[PDB]
Amino acid sequence: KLKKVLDKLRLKRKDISEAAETVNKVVERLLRRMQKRESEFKGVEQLNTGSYYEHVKISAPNEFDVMFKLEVPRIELQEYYETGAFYLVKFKRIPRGNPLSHFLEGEVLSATKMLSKFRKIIKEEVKEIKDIDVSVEKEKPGSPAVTLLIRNPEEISVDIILALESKGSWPISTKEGLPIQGWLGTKVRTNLRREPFYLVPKNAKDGNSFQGETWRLSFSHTEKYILNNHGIEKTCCESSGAKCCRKECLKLMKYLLEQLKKEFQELDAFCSYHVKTAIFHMWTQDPQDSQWDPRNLSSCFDKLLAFFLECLRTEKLDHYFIPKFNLFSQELIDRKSKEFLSKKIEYERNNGFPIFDKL
Amino acid sequence: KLKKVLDKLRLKRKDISEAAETVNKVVERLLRRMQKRESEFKGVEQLNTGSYYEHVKISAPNEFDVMFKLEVPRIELQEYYETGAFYLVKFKRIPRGNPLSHFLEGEVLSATKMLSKFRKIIKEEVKEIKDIDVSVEKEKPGSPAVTLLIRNPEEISVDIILALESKGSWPISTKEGLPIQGWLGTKVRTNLRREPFYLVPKNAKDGNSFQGETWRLSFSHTEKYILNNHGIEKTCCESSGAKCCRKECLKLMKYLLEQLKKEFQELDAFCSYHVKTAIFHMWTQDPQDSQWDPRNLSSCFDKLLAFFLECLRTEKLDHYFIPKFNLFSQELIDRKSKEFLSKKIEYERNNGFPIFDKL
DNA sequence: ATCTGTACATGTACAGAT
DNA sequence: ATCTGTACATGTACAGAT
C-alpha cells in the first residue's frame, strides 16, 4: 500500500547521476567565482543542505540546496524583539578596511545589501556560462536564497543560500532547544552545540523595523546530521544494523503536503519545513527504533498524521531549535488555513489517501 | 554482594584531587621541558590514556598512563615476520635537518636510542623538581614507558609512554580488527579508523634480531573512546539513559586478576590488558545494552569468567585490533601458567570469591 | 604598528558526595 | 535526589615576538 507509494517516490539512479553532474558544474563554477574573484565573499565555503543531501528527496532529483558559508569574525547579535530566530548583527569592533565595509550601516550588517551583492555576482557569473541552460529565478521577498533554474532537459532548481558562520556559543534562545537528550543523547547534543551556528539573510516581516538588515538562524547543518544519525541505536539503518521507517514517514508526509499544496492554493502558507519540524518532535516523543519498525509503517505514518493534526488544532508547532518560536502562530498562519489543511488531511486519512494515486 | 565489592573498589574524590594535582604538575613540567630548546622531541603532544581516564581504575588512584606522542610525517613500515603487531620504521626520505637523524640506524629508526634520550631528558628534569618526592623507576624490560614514582605521601606510578603518531591509514594487519559493526556500528568504526595510529618501543631484551629497532602498534586512544562510548544505544550510562554494568564487569575482572597476581608469582605473564581484550570481545559477542543490565551483574560477570576460562583452555586470545596476534600464544605464555590461572579462577568462582575479601 | 602561542574562559559528561 | 571536582573540548585575550 504505502510500500507502493514509496516505490513511486523513490529517485532513480540515472536521474540522480544526470542531475548531479550538472548542478555540480554550476555550483562549482559559482563557488570558484566567489573567491577566485577578489570579491568580498572570498573565503566562502560549500555546505550542501536539505532533502536531497538528507536522502529524503522524493519523486525526482529536481531541487538542490547549498549554503555558501562565510566565517565572519567576532560579531555581536541582538534579538529582533522576542522572536528567538531573528537578529541584527553588529560588529563588536569593526576591524575596518574589511571586505564588508559597504554592507554596514550604523555598526549594523545589512542583510539586504549583502544579499544583493551576492545575487549581483551570481547573476553576473550565470550570464558567463554557455554549456548549460541556467537562469536566475526572480527574487522572492522573504527568501534568503538566490535561486537558479536549470533545464537539463528537465527542470531543476538550486538554492544558493548565503550564510554567516559564527563560532561562539549558540544564542540563548536555543538553550532549551534541540531536546534530543533521551533519544540521541547528551554527548551528541553537547557536540552538536559545539558546532558553529549560521545566520541567514531572511528578512523579518511587518515592514515595520529593521526588516532589511535582519538575519535569521539556521541549523541546516545540525538537521542534516540528525537525519543521517537518527536512531537511538548506533547501527540504525547501517549495513550491520536494522532498518527503521523514520525517513520513509518523512517522505510520505512530505508527499501528502506536496500533493495537497499542488491542488489547493489555500495551503500556500504551509511548507515542508513544518513537516520536518513535526517529525523531529515525533522522533523525540518516540525515541526507540522499535517504535519505527518497518513492519509498522502504516501505524507510524498514522501517528505522525495525528500529531500533525494536533499541532494544527492547538495551533502550536515550536521550532525544534528555538522553543519560543511558534511556526503555527495565528500571526504566521491564518486559523482558517489550518482548519482547511486539517479537513483535507482528515479526508485523505479516512479514505485511504486517494491523492497518493493521482499525479 | 558484588555490589559491596564495587563499593570497596570505588575511588574517593579527596584522593583523586590529591593525586591529580601532583601528577598534573609533574606531567605539565615534563611536557614543557620536551617542548624547549632544540630537543629531538619538540612537537610532542600529550594524550592521557589507560584505566584512570577510562574510569575503570580501582582501589586507589595510584597509576596514571600518559602518552607523549610525536607526529612522524613521511613514514614507511616494514612488518616484523608476519606478527601483525611488530614493525620496523623507515624514513625512505632524507634528513633535511631531521631531529630524528640522531636515532637513525641506517635507514631505520632505533626504538632503544630514542627511548634512551627521552629517558635521559626526563631524568634530568625530574632532578630539577624540588617540590615533591618524585623519582624515575629502574627501566623494565619490554616497557615502552619511563615510569615515575611519586611519594605524594601515598605512592603513585606515572607511565610516560613515548609514541610515534602516524596519520596515514592503519596497517593491513588491523583490517579485520576492531569488529564493532554490529555493536557500535560502521559509521563509528570508519571514524575511529580515520584517527591516527600509534607505535611504541617494543624494548624487549630477549636477544633476537632487530631487538632495539622494533616498535609495537598502540590504540590506547581508540580504547579510551570505546570505554567512554560503549553502548549500542547512544544514551547508555547517560543521564537520560539507562545505566549498564559493562565497566563494573571490567572492574571486577581487573580486581580478581590483581588480587591473584599479588598472591601468586606464577601469574607474572598475565596482565590487565588480557582482561581488557577479553571483555572487548565479550562486548562484541553480546552487543545489546540489555545483555549488560545492572540487575544481572552476577550473570554478566560470570559469563565473562566463563569466556576468559576458555581463552586460557584453548590458548587463544586474539588482540582486538590485530586478529592474527594471539596474546595467549604458546610462545608468550606457558601452558602451565594458563592451567594455573584457570584453576585459580575456577576455584574463586566456585567458592564465593574469598579472594575478594582479602586485605 | 600587527601577530600569534600560550593559557585563561566557558561548558558539560562523568561519576563520587552528601 | 541534588551538588560538585576532574577531564576535556573549544573559544578568545593579550604579552611578547616581529
Add this chain to the structure above:
DNA sequence: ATCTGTACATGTACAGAT
C-alpha cells in the same frame, strides 16, 4: 592553499534466492 586520492557511508537496480 588548492587540489587529487582514498575509503566508505548513503543510496538505487536487478537477477536469483526464499
Add this chain to the structure above:
DNA sequence: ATCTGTACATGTACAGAT
C-alpha cells in the same frame, strides 16, 4: 509477493602534495 547479495553511483571527510 519479500529477502539477499553484488554491481553501480554520489556525497563527504581528510591526508598529503605542490
